[PDB]
Amino acid sequence: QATDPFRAAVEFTLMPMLITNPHLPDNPIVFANPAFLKLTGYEADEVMGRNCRFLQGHGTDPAHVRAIKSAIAAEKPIDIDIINYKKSGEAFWNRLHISPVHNANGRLQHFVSSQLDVTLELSRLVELEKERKTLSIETARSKDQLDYIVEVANIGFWTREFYSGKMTCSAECRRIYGFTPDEPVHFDTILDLVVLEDRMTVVQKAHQAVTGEPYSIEYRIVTRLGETRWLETRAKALTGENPLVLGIVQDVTERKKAEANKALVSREIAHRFKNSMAMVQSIANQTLRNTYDPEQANRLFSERLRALSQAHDMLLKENWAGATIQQICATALAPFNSTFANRIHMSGPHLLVSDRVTVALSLAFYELATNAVKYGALSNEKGVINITWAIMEDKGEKKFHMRWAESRGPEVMQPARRGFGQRLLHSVLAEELKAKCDVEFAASGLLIDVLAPITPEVFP
Amino acid sequence: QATDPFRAAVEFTLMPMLITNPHLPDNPIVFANPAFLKLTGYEADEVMGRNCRFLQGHGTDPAHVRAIKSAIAAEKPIDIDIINYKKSGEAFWNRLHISPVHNANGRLQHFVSSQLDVTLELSRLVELEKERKTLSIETARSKDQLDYIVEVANIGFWTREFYSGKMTCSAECRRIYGFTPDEPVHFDTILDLVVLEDRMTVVQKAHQAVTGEPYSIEYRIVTRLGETRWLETRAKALTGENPLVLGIVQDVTERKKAEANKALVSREIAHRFKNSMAMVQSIANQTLRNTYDPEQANRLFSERLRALSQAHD
Ligand SMILES: Cc1cc2nc3c(=O)[nH]c(=O)nc-3n(C[C@H](O)[C@H](O)[C@H](O)COP(=O)(O)O)c2cc1C
Ligand SMILES: Cc1cc2nc3c(=O)[nH]c(=O)nc-3n(C[C@H](O)[C@H](O)[C@H](O)COP(=O)(O)O)c2cc1C
Ligand SMILES: Nc1ncnc2c1ncn2[C@@H]1O[C@H](COP(=O)(O)OP(=O)(O)CP(=O)(O)O)[C@@H](O)[C@H]1O
Ligand SMILES: [Cl-]
Ligand SMILES: [Cl-]
Ligand SMILES: [Cl-]
Ligand SMILES: [Mg+2]
């Protein structure tokens, strides 16, 4: 009585469909629903008895055609897109969902398909690919930029799998350590380079990095070639699936090497000043004290400081490179040689002495000569002062020797005191040379002997 | 052995399809292609012998259900959209394409429908509109990771667009020069700090940067505040579409003038401390004329020697 409803499905549905017969020769379209003929534009008889192949053309990819024909003989289904041309020739994209109808025996008997004009994704490919290409070329620009800032500037780059301990070391990182460009790295291999003082800090931090919290370490290493390097390292664990700790490691040696030296400059200055400020600790200790002549004790102070400030300018012909005894023996004893012209004699080699001794020199020179004018040989008319110094030896060393000899003076009696010089000599002149100092009050003249081992804080 | 190619053509198509049986109570469903059990996620035994009504729900415009019930009654086709609900509960538009099946006399025997989801269709225009921006975010992610490394490693970085002359200056680069955190830098702002005796060298190899030939240069700048600084600039040229000149700069005013630093400091830490302590002790020159000044003229001097030893502690 009544028809088959499944034909009314394929007949009325707006989905273009097709049936073909692979027992008829060359698999011809036996059925074409009206939608397939609204899609293609051809007429009912024009698409019957022919093979679908007729929709292809010059732009139709002859590679897709192989893929379909392959599966048809395989008797397996196939989904694929291909170019087709409307009856008016207007090409479109045709998506084919092609399936093989088997019967009860298991032998093929029909092919069925569903066709769709998926020429909307054509503009979707042109949009998506044109953009996501120029955007992955935008990235390729900011790759080479980052890559270059790491060639230069030497930026190390390491990772540690927080769960397993797997490590990755970038080339600059391997360059910063003493590492072969391709040997395996673990926490192991790095810590074996950290100086023993700084190990427990590294361990405590590498076992701390569960917090996902950016830490920052400084630690020194000793490369496999004996070189020593300071390192800053900033890390920050990225929690997630495989928790990686990501770290930056850069070499900060030239900064550290130059920091801990620029402080050494102002370190000695803070030592050459609690010695020079406390140098006048003695110059004012004795001079303007409880004297019978506070008016003349500043006639003397301004004369013993006019000589200490002479012990500062000798270090200007040479950049504090000490001075020569040949120049200092002229520095402090040229004012005397005005009145006592050619009555003080200097004998010795052209030598060299550290600048923290050239100060205690031009004072002991100026002080002892002042003693010669008061009590000693530079007081009378025909007194003379003999200064001899020469490098010689006794107990195997190459030690230093000098003599203050006062000849043709007045007979030297004995001192009833032991004033400022007699300890300016034993205490801040012997402790300026590692010296063994001596004084004899011979009746003939003042005999002063000095003996100093060579330790280039005294003899450069 | 004689299977139907039509019974198999709907069997396999991806268009949801229904065939109902009006000559039965309630006009129930007696066929649903698997393309229907996907669209509604229901099992097989869950849509057979039950009216297509059961897909409707609480948000279904009833004036729609009226014209559908009306066309069914009058044996007409209908092409309408209606809000239906999946087995999950998803609120999705449903495009009903319904047709009558009139037998060989003109007598309503069957009803057929091809269902079309206009929620999976009308969303793919915004399912990859959210993909065009995932790939616009990976791009901005990589220009960021650059910016991120330049910060954490505190690196003085600069980029001169070779054609245009536009420049970008990293933070540390702007701190090395005497530069505002965000002032517009070009080549002038960097040259106006160069000392006269080094401008030619800066210029000579700033035009010699065209040929992708990496170059290093040292030169002095007098900062805006008066500080003099030595800088080593290592630069290059990436030749892509528009060539970017890549360059790094670091303050070396130390590895340079440290011979003079250590020297010309003692040349003034004694130049003005011999000069500076040779007169503060001329104050003991202005306290001595009476007696017992080693009792008060030292209470008027020892308060100046740790007034300078504490001015540096
Ligand atoms: C049911 C069915 C429908 C097909 N529909 C089309 C079609 O619409 N457009 C098309 O180019 N090819 C279609 N084909 C593929 C062609 O029929 C043919 O197989 C293709 O051109 C490759 O095979 P051939 O090299 O022997 O021609 C269809 C195939 C089958 C089995
Ligand atoms: C072939 C066919 C398919 C139908 N498919 C749906 C459907 O998918 N969703 C829906 O809400 N209604 C569908 N209907 C409509 C409902 O079954 C029915 O018309 C609705 O309940 C309104 O009639 P009523 O007031 O008697 O319930 C379909 C009707 C037919 C004849
Ligand atoms: N060149 C010399 N020749 C002989 N005797 C000397 C001498 N220099 C010092 N004396 C003797 O040693 C004593 C103390 O020597 P010293 O020079 O250290 O103190 P002083 O009396 O000169 C006070 P001040 O040293 O502060 O000027 C003198 O009084 C003197 O007897
Ligand atoms: Cl670490
Ligand atoms: Cl049936
Ligand atoms: Cl430049
Ligand atoms: Mg004396």
Residue numbers in the entry:
A (entry chain B): 18 to 477
B (entry chain A): 18 to 330
Share the article's original sentences.
LOV-HK is a blue light photoreceptor from Brucella abortus, a pathogenic α-2-proteobacterium that can be transmitted from cattle to humans causing brucellosis. B. abortus LOV-HK comprises an N-terminal blue light-sensing LOV domain, a central PAS (Per-Arnt-Sim) domain of unknown function and a C-terminal HK domain. The LOV and PAS domains are connected through a long linker helix denoted the Jα helix, while the HK domain belongs to the HWE family. Upon blue light illumination, B. abortus LOV-HK photobleaches as a result of the adduct formation between its flavin mononucleotide (FMN) chromophore and an adjacent conserved cysteine residue as in other LOV proteins.
We have also determined the crystal structure of LOV-PAS-HK in the light state at 3.25 Å resolution. This full-length structure also shows a head-to-head, parallel scaffold from the N-terminal LOV domain to the C-terminal HK domain with a large surface area (10,240 Å2) buried at the dimer interface. Consistent with the light state of the LOV photoreceptors, the electron densities associated with the FMN chromophores are fused into the protein moiety in both LOV domains (right). The nonhydrolyzable ATP analogue AMP-PCP (ACP) was added to the crystallization buffer to stabilize the HK domain. Only one of the two CA subdomains could be modeled due to the weak electron density. As a result, the LOV-PAS-HK structure is a highly asymmetric dimer with an overall curvature of ∼150° pivoted around the PAS domain. Concomitantly, the PAS dimer in the full-length structure is rotated about 90° as if the helical spine were unwound, thereby placing the LOV and PAS domains from the same subunit on the same side of the dimer scaffold. In contrast to the dark LOV-PAS structure where the coiled coil interactions are mostly “in-register” or symmetric mediated by equivalent residues (Leu137A-Leu137B and Leu142A-Leu142B), the N-terminal half of the Jα helices engages new “off-register” or asymmetric interactions between residues shifted by one helical turn in the light LOV-PAS-HK structure. Second, as the helical spine enters the HK domain, one of the parallel DHp helices (DHp-A) becomes melted or deformed, while DHp-B retains its α-helical conformation. In accordance, the light structure of LOV-HK in the active state is highly asymmetric, where the ordered CA subdomain adopts an inactive form, while the disordered CA subdomain enables cis-autophosphorylation.
